[PDB]
Design a protein around this motif. Structure first.
Motif, PDB file in Angstrom:
ATOM      1  N   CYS A  17      72.298   5.452  36.412  1.00  0.00           N
ATOM      2  CA  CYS A  17      73.705   5.140  36.487  1.00  0.00           C
ATOM      3  C   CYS A  17      74.518   6.344  36.100  1.00  0.00           C
ATOM      4  N   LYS A  18      74.162   7.014  34.985  1.00  0.00           N
ATOM      5  CA  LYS A  18      74.925   8.157  34.536  1.00  0.00           C
ATOM      6  C   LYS A  18      74.835   9.275  35.544  1.00  0.00           C
ATOM      7  N   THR A  19      73.625   9.525  36.092  1.00  0.00           N
ATOM      8  CA  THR A  19      73.455  10.616  37.030  1.00  0.00           C
ATOM      9  C   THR A  19      74.161  10.316  38.325  1.00  0.00           C
ATOM     10  N   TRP A  20      74.362   9.028  38.657  1.00  0.00           N
ATOM     11  CA  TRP A  20      75.018   8.701  39.901  1.00  0.00           C
ATOM     12  C   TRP A  20      76.370   8.119  39.607  1.00  0.00           C
ATOM     13  N   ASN A  21      76.970   8.445  38.438  1.00  0.00           N
ATOM     14  CA  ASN A  21      78.264   7.887  38.135  1.00  0.00           C
ATOM     15  C   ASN A  21      79.307   8.792  38.744  1.00  0.00           C
ATOM     16  N   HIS A  22      79.731   9.846  38.014  1.00  0.00           N
ATOM     17  CA  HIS A  22      80.709  10.757  38.565  1.00  0.00           C
ATOM     18  C   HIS A  22      80.518  12.115  37.950  1.00  0.00           C
ATOM     19  N   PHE A  23      79.505  12.268  37.053  1.00  0.00           N
ATOM     20  CA  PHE A  23      79.284  13.536  36.373  1.00  0.00           C
ATOM     21  C   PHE A  23      80.578  13.987  35.736  1.00  0.00           C
ATOM     22  N   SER A  24      81.429  13.036  35.285  1.00  0.00           N
ATOM     23  CA  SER A  24      82.693  13.407  34.699  1.00  0.00           C
ATOM     24  C   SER A  24      82.575  13.305  33.209  1.00  0.00           C
ATOM     25  N   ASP A  25      83.597  13.837  32.501  1.00  0.00           N
ATOM     26  CA  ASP A  25      83.592  13.821  31.059  1.00  0.00           C
ATOM     27  C   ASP A  25      84.147  12.506  30.582  1.00  0.00           C
ATOM     28  N   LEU A  49      67.846  -7.653  35.924  1.00  0.00           N
ATOM     29  CA  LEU A  49      68.090  -6.244  35.666  1.00  0.00           C
ATOM     30  C   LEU A  49      67.495  -5.431  36.795  1.00  0.00           C
ATOM     31  N   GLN A  50      66.297  -5.840  37.254  1.00  0.00           N
ATOM     32  CA  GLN A  50      65.612  -5.153  38.325  1.00  0.00           C
ATOM     33  C   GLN A  50      66.430  -5.256  39.587  1.00  0.00           C
ATOM     34  N   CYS A  51      67.068  -6.425  39.814  1.00  0.00           N
ATOM     35  CA  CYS A  51      67.854  -6.628  41.015  1.00  0.00           C
ATOM     36  C   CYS A  51      68.973  -5.616  41.051  1.00  0.00           C
ATOM     37  N   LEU A  52      69.674  -5.432  39.913  1.00  0.00           N
ATOM     38  CA  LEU A  52      70.768  -4.487  39.854  1.00  0.00           C
ATOM     39  C   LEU A  52      70.248  -3.094  40.105  1.00  0.00           C
ATOM     40  N   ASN A  53      69.052  -2.770  39.565  1.00  0.00           N
ATOM     41  CA  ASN A  53      68.486  -1.449  39.739  1.00  0.00           C
ATOM     42  C   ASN A  53      68.191  -1.217  41.200  1.00  0.00           C
ATOM     43  N   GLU A  54      67.690  -2.253  41.895  1.00  0.00           N
ATOM     44  CA  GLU A  54      67.348  -2.104  43.288  1.00  0.00           C
ATOM     45  C   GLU A  54      68.594  -1.814  44.086  1.00  0.00           C
ATOM     46  N   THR A  55      69.711  -2.495  43.762  1.00  0.00           N
ATOM     47  CA  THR A  55      70.941  -2.296  44.506  1.00  0.00           C
ATOM     48  C   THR A  55      71.398  -0.864  44.367  1.00  0.00           C
ATOM     49  N   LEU A  56      71.412  -0.339  43.125  1.00  0.00           N
ATOM     50  CA  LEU A  56      71.868   1.021  42.922  1.00  0.00           C
ATOM     51  C   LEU A  56      70.842   2.008  43.427  1.00  0.00           C
ATOM     52  N   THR A  57      69.627   1.550  43.825  1.00  0.00           N
ATOM     53  CA  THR A  57      68.624   2.468  44.328  1.00  0.00           C
ATOM     54  C   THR A  57      68.508   2.206  45.812  1.00  0.00           C
ATOM     55  N   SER A  58      69.387   1.314  46.317  1.00  0.00           N
ATOM     56  CA  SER A  58      69.376   0.966  47.723  1.00  0.00           C
ATOM     57  C   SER A  58      70.677   1.411  48.323  1.00  0.00           C
ATOM     58  N   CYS A  59      71.628   1.833  47.466  1.00  0.00           N
ATOM     59  CA  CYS A  59      72.919   2.253  47.949  1.00  0.00           C
ATOM     60  C   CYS A  59      73.149   3.680  47.541  1.00  0.00           C
ATOM     61  N   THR A  60      74.270   4.262  48.035  1.00  0.00           N
ATOM     62  CA  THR A  60      74.613   5.631  47.716  1.00  0.00           C
ATOM     63  C   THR A  60      75.066   5.672  46.281  1.00  0.00           C
ATOM     64  N   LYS A  61      75.448   6.867  45.786  1.00  0.00           N
ATOM     65  CA  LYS A  61      75.861   6.984  44.407  1.00  0.00           C
ATOM     66  C   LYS A  61      77.170   6.266  44.164  1.00  0.00           C
ATOM     67  N   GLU A  62      78.171   6.405  45.065  1.00  0.00           N
ATOM     68  CA  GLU A  62      79.448   5.757  44.839  1.00  0.00           C
ATOM     69  C   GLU A  62      79.310   4.268  45.016  1.00  0.00           C
ATOM     70  N   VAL A  63      78.595   3.847  46.076  1.00  0.00           N
ATOM     71  CA  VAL A  63      78.433   2.434  46.342  1.00  0.00           C
ATOM     72  C   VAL A  63      77.614   1.830  45.231  1.00  0.00           C
ATOM     73  N   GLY A  64      76.531   2.527  44.840  1.00  0.00           N
ATOM     74  CA  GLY A  64      75.657   2.063  43.789  1.00  0.00           C
ATOM     75  C   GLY A  64      76.406   1.967  42.493  1.00  0.00           C
ATOM     76  N   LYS A  65      77.339   2.906  42.234  1.00  0.00           N
ATOM     77  CA  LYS A  65      78.063   2.889  40.982  1.00  0.00           C
ATOM     78  C   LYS A  65      79.012   1.722  40.967  1.00  0.00           C
ATOM     79  N   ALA A  66      79.747   1.521  42.080  1.00  0.00           N
ATOM     80  CA  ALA A  66      80.713   0.450  42.139  1.00  0.00           C
ATOM     81  C   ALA A  66      79.997  -0.873  42.118  1.00  0.00           C
ATOM     82  N   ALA A  67      78.898  -0.970  42.892  1.00  0.00           N
ATOM     83  CA  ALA A  67      78.139  -2.192  42.972  1.00  0.00           C
ATOM     84  C   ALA A  67      77.532  -2.492  41.635  1.00  0.00           C
ATOM     85  N   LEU A  68      77.043  -1.452  40.930  1.00  0.00           N
ATOM     86  CA  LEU A  68      76.410  -1.659  39.654  1.00  0.00           C
ATOM     87  C   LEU A  68      77.430  -2.147  38.666  1.00  0.00           C
TER      88      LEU A  68
END
Length: 89
Positions: A17-25, A49-68
């Motif tokens: 999540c952090k690596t695919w968040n926004h790399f912002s401060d 928890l696994q379901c959420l992980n799959e979604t963020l590992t099934s979507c792009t970083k922005e989509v995964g972040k928003a979806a997560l």
């Protein structure tokens, strides 16, 4: 009673999540999400928890972040529901 599978998934999900968040401060945003993810680890089943992980590992970083975030908030609500009964008794 307790499984480390959820912890492993949490470590994966949180790290991803952090690596695919926004790399912002802006850590405060992630802080609320982290608090919710901590709540997920505490009472949520690893299956969810696994379901959420799959979604963020099934979507792009922005989509995964928003979806997560959206999924985490929904899960947090479910945790709150359990907390309400837990607080009751």
């Amino acid at each position: 009673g307790s499984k480390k599978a959820i912890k492993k998934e949490r470590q994966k999900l949180r790290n991803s999540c952090k690596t695919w968040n926004h790399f912002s401060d802006n850590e405060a945003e992630r802080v609320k999400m982290m608090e919710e993810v901590e709540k997920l680890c505490d009472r949520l089943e690893l299956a969810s928890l696994q379901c959420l992980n799959e979604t963020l590992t099934s979507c792009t970083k922005e989509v995964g972040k928003a979806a997560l975030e959206k999924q985490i908030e929904e899960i947090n609500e479910q945790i709150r529901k359990e907390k309400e009964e837990a607080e009751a008794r």
